[PDB]
Symmetry: D2
Subunit: 254 residues, 4 copies
Amino acid sequence: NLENKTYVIMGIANKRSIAFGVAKVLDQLGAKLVFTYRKERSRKELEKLLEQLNQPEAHLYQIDVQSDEEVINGFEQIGKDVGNIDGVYHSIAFANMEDLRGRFSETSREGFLLAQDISSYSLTIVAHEAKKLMPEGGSIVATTYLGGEFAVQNYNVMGVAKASLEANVKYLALDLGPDNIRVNAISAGPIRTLSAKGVGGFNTILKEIEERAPLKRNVDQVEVGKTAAYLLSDLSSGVTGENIHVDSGFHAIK
Amino acid sequence: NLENKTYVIMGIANKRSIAFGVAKVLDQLGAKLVFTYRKERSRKELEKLLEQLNQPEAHLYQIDVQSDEEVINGFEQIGKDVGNIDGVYHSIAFANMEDLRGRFSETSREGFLLAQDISSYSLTIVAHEAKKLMPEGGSIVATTYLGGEFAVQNYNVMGVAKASLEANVKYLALDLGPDNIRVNAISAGPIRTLSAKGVGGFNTILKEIEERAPLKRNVDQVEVGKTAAYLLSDLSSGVTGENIHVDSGFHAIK
Amino acid sequence: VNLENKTYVIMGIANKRSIAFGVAKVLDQLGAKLVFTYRKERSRKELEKLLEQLNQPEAHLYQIDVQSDEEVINGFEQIGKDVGNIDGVYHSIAFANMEDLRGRFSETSREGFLLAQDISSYSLTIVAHEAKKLMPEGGSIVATTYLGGEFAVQNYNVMGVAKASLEANVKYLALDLGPDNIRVNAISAGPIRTLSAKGVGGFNTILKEIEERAPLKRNVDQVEVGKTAAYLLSDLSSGVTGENIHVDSGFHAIK
Amino acid sequence: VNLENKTYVIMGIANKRSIAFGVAKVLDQLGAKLVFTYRKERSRKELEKLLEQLNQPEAHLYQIDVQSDEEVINGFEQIGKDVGNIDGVYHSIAFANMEDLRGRFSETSREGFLLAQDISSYSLTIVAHEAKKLMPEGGSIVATTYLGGEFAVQNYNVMGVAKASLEANVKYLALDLGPDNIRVNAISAGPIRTLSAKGVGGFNTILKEIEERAPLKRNVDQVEVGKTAAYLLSDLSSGVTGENIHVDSGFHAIK
Ligand SMILES: NC(=O)c1ccc[n+]([C@@H]2O[C@H](COP(=O)([O-])OP(=O)(O)OC[C@H]3O[C@@H](n4cnc5c(N)ncnc54)[C@H](OP(=O)(O)O)[C@@H]3O)[C@@H](O)[C@H]2O)c1
Ligand SMILES: NC(=O)c1ccc[n+]([C@@H]2O[C@H](COP(=O)([O-])OP(=O)(O)OC[C@H]3O[C@@H](n4cnc5c(N)ncnc54)[C@H](OP(=O)(O)O)[C@@H]3O)[C@@H](O)[C@H]2O)c1
Ligand SMILES: NC(=O)c1ccc[n+]([C@@H]2O[C@H](COP(=O)([O-])OP(=O)(O)OC[C@H]3O[C@@H](n4cnc5c(N)ncnc54)[C@H](OP(=O)(O)O)[C@@H]3O)[C@@H](O)[C@H]2O)c1
Ligand SMILES: NC(=O)c1ccc[n+]([C@@H]2O[C@H](COP(=O)([O-])OP(=O)(O)OC[C@H]3O[C@@H](n4cnc5c(N)ncnc54)[C@H](OP(=O)(O)O)[C@@H]3O)[C@@H](O)[C@H]2O)c1
Ligand SMILES: Oc1cc(Cl)ccc1Oc1ccc(Cl)cc1Cl
Ligand SMILES: Oc1cc(Cl)ccc1Oc1ccc(Cl)cc1Cl
Ligand SMILES: Oc1cc(Cl)ccc1Oc1ccc(Cl)cc1Cl
Ligand SMILES: Oc1cc(Cl)ccc1Oc1ccc(Cl)cc1Cl
Ligand SMILES: N[C@@H](CCC(=O)O)C(=O)O
Ligand SMILES: N[C@@H](CCC(=O)O)C(=O)O
Ligand SMILES: N[C@@H](CCC(=O)O)C(=O)O
């Protein structure tokens, strides 16, 4: 039960976003939620999607995590509007398709660095600013993919960005542990989202999970959301620096 | 919320057992619980301990996991007394004391095979017998230790038994996944228990966590029990073949 | 790499396809003196034939069934008397019963699970304890494992749990014996057609998966395992212990 | 091994304590022709002097700042015209600001994080791309990493995240270049006293902890890394790619 808790959820674009799965679970459990977005179009979808939740009010903030000033001023404004928070769900990544759909060895410098910036460094800075609203401690979750742990076909520059993200969770866990702030990752199996359309071969990845993964089915956004609830709540006290695979067991087989 | 769930908890020795932590938590959450014990000092005991739970009956079964008959007939009888169950917590391990200190290279064949038998194979047979009481699926959790993933001083033969136990979980996840049975582990940090006494140099292990783990503190039986409630329930539906460290982040640092 | 004036015990040659025969060819070619141990007289007869291919001036052949403490103990002690001190051991030994290597893992019998642990894991422990007696200036023990020890692979079943156990055994041995200057390491070999692979269900589809999906897009062979064994058993790998090197065309690194 | 008529590019020698210099000595002793790349004009001066300890009859020194594509592109092209085709590249390059290193990880600057990614991880990718043009029959590329890429190590901070990225870069390149018969691997070296180690807070307690706790109970040295490099760069390691070999006295394997 999450009444009297407040979570910031970053990275909803539409109803298929993984962070909307998180939102529904946390809302169902009585949490107060605050949302962040980059594009106008995403604020618009948030304004619509809120009509399905129980949030008595829209708490929406534009934060493009490429900008320090936006991350810093964003969280400062959230603190002024709703007070201290209990956690952050981070559901944000980006890379160019021009890099993704080429050979990994042909990745450009600007594109490799773009992916690191949005997909990994953004957690470091978000945690830094979020820490200020968690003086009694709290919980931070980021979303990763098994391509951070192994070389998967076509995932390419994003796989290197996710490896970087998973180490970021571990170094943040260590840094922020004494402040009673836990930092963890969920490694989600493939789910049809707007961003999935950038991963070449995506339907093939879905089919391989059904045919090979222990549970012989794909996961969805609500399943990622239920494990987020566990990680953002006191149910997972003691658990930090961990990568929980919500992927029908695919990580465990070869 | 676990009202109308039933869980078999194996491995309570006394008020300090990790499995009793698990029991208080599932009991608080409204589960019907069933308990197995090895021998008749644990029983007398057990009976007294359960006045602290809201269990309105005492369902207790002797099962020494070294005997097929006892496991086969114990789950059979459980099945007859309470019907289908929703999951199994396995909290059971053993090795000879001489082996948990001094030199791993001097371990006896008998001592090595005894630790494998009780600490690893017992999950395979308990799984096979429990599956019979879970026609619509369910959840199996075992308790391991970092010494199954890394060589740790003194833990010696039990570390090889936990390596084996951790694979056991993965192979059972693969096998039982189509039957909708999830199989996972919780890698607990060190906890002062009756069995901890037999681990060479336990007190130093304890202190190392406080000094070096991200949370700078040790965990307890109830923090294990909370992650057990997660893994035993539908919050973790997308999760199988997994090992969750409830160890203050220790597993993530070096 | 030159291994003249080194001496290596190789355990688990059955025939010309054995992984340990790849190791033997490579070590022998590098000038090492080799001692071979076998379980069945048929393997000894095979060893006698296979030696005529190697440069070894003599046959050092010992029957050691690793289920027997006395055979391991008396075998290594006899080896010490015939050749003196050794430089390392290549361990290439596993077993489980047929029925535990296809279909369903949850149905594994206690007897079959413990058999597999006994031969495929505990053997390395007692071998190392006895071999250590012949390595007073230090040396190098290598065991052979498979990717099924790290992940659940279809059909591998009880052997996978045996390999997990082997891989932790290597780590505990490494820690225990490091101060004696004995390194202990594993080679995680890719799938290779051998007599014992006839026991793994779906083995042909395993090979074919490697060709299609592994970074090098081809299978490995026994000599490539023997080349990494030469590195591990020699002074090139000083510093390296508790380590599991995958000779498998990259397959462990991909999903 | 046996590396005559092989040619390797070694990137990242600054002085006699550099890890890459340990690679150079081992490879040079094994008969390789070596080509050296540097950033600072002062590192070139050290090379010219370190080269008298070596059997290289010719000094092949090239300035390449891996921050600049132009420099990596023109550098390898020039190498190709001066020495023809090469057999492999040893990459020993990393960098991050002190000011980011010696602050709390959570206080890392965006610009210092991207700097460490750019020099210590991206550089392998572009190096691999340009070096492929000089390896039409295949070859081997080895990068240097540290345990702090796999676990959160006190003080290593932004470099830990750059090494994690570098270890993944290795696996993705292994996959991409495998069909070209180019293997790409990492060595995970234990702590070694070098100029760059001065940047790591608590470096001397890291050394002491290896001596007290690692299976071998001693630290490793640059030559030990060089010897595993010789294996990885040569045909002994055929079949090995996407791999991370810990040259660290076993420390990776214990907790
Ligand atoms: N779908 C899957 O199979 C899968 C599997 C595993 C992991 N993941 C991870 O899950 C996370 C969420 O992605 P998703 O699949 O749910 O796709 P999604 O719905 O497309 O969400 C991606 C989100 O990232 C945000 N974003 C990108 N760049 C940003 C920036 N500079 N500043 C702020 N926000 C930015 C986008 O916001 P705007 O649209 O406003 O630009 C969008 O809300 C990602 O980290 C992804 O890598 C996805
Ligand atoms: N405490 C820790 O720091 C630690 C850390 C990580 C993991 N673990 C794991 O947690 C689990 C529980 O241990 P614990 O620390 O809670 O110790 P514990 O209270 O002493 O529990 C051990 C239990 O195992 C039971 N058992 C032993 N052999 C058995 C057999 N042959 N058949 C049936 N039951 C048998 C014992 O029963 P009897 O008393 O009747 O003999 C006892 O109830 C173990 O698997 C252990 O390795 C412990
Ligand atoms: N082939 C592969 O794809 C592959 C892949 C990865 C790992 N491996 C591993 O490589 C190792 C060698 O197997 P292989 O494929 O080369 O098969 P192999 O030629 O059939 O060799 C197996 C050896 O194990 C010996 N053995 C079995 N039980 C023994 C016992 N109790 N005492 C002494 N020796 C015993 C056999 O000797 P006898 O015939 O005399 O009984 C035989 O020489 C094993 O650990 C295997 O698991 C194989
Ligand atoms: N020392 C250890 O304990 C340890 C342990 C594990 C891994 N490693 C790794 O080993 C590698 C070598 O470091 P080291 O310890 O040998 O220290 P080092 O002697 O200080 O070598 C570092 C080299 O990096 C080069 N470099 C930095 N930025 C560069 C750039 N932009 N372009 C081209 N070259 C650049 C330096 O060149 P200039 O001097 O010309 O600037 C220097 O030659 C690094 O990847 C390091 O992370 C070191
Ligand atoms: O990480 C992902 C993994 C998968 Cl299988 C599918 C979608 C993913 O998400 C992304 C993939 C590429 C880009 Cl450019 C951005 C995002 Cl959010
Ligand atoms: O696994 C354990 C790990 C730790 Cl740190 C402490 C206690 C543990 O539990 C055991 C240890 C030894 C034996 Cl013989 C039996 C059990 Cl239950
Ligand atoms: O470990 C192995 C892995 C593979 Cl892919 C192929 C063969 C293997 O070797 C064995 C397999 C089963 C048994 Cl009963 C004995 C051995 Cl020696
Ligand atoms: O990676 C390393 C690890 C260790 Cl233990 C010691 C030195 C290392 O090398 C570096 C450390 C910091 C910077 Cl700024 C640059 C380099 Cl080359
Ligand atoms: N059809 C795209 C794949 C993208 C997807 O399936 O989302 C390709 O393979 O080029
Ligand atoms: N054809 C049988 C034999 C096994 C094998 O070829 O290894 C199977 O695949 O089950
Ligand atoms: N003097 C540094 C240590 C630097 C080093 O040990 O290289 C400190 O702040 O600990």
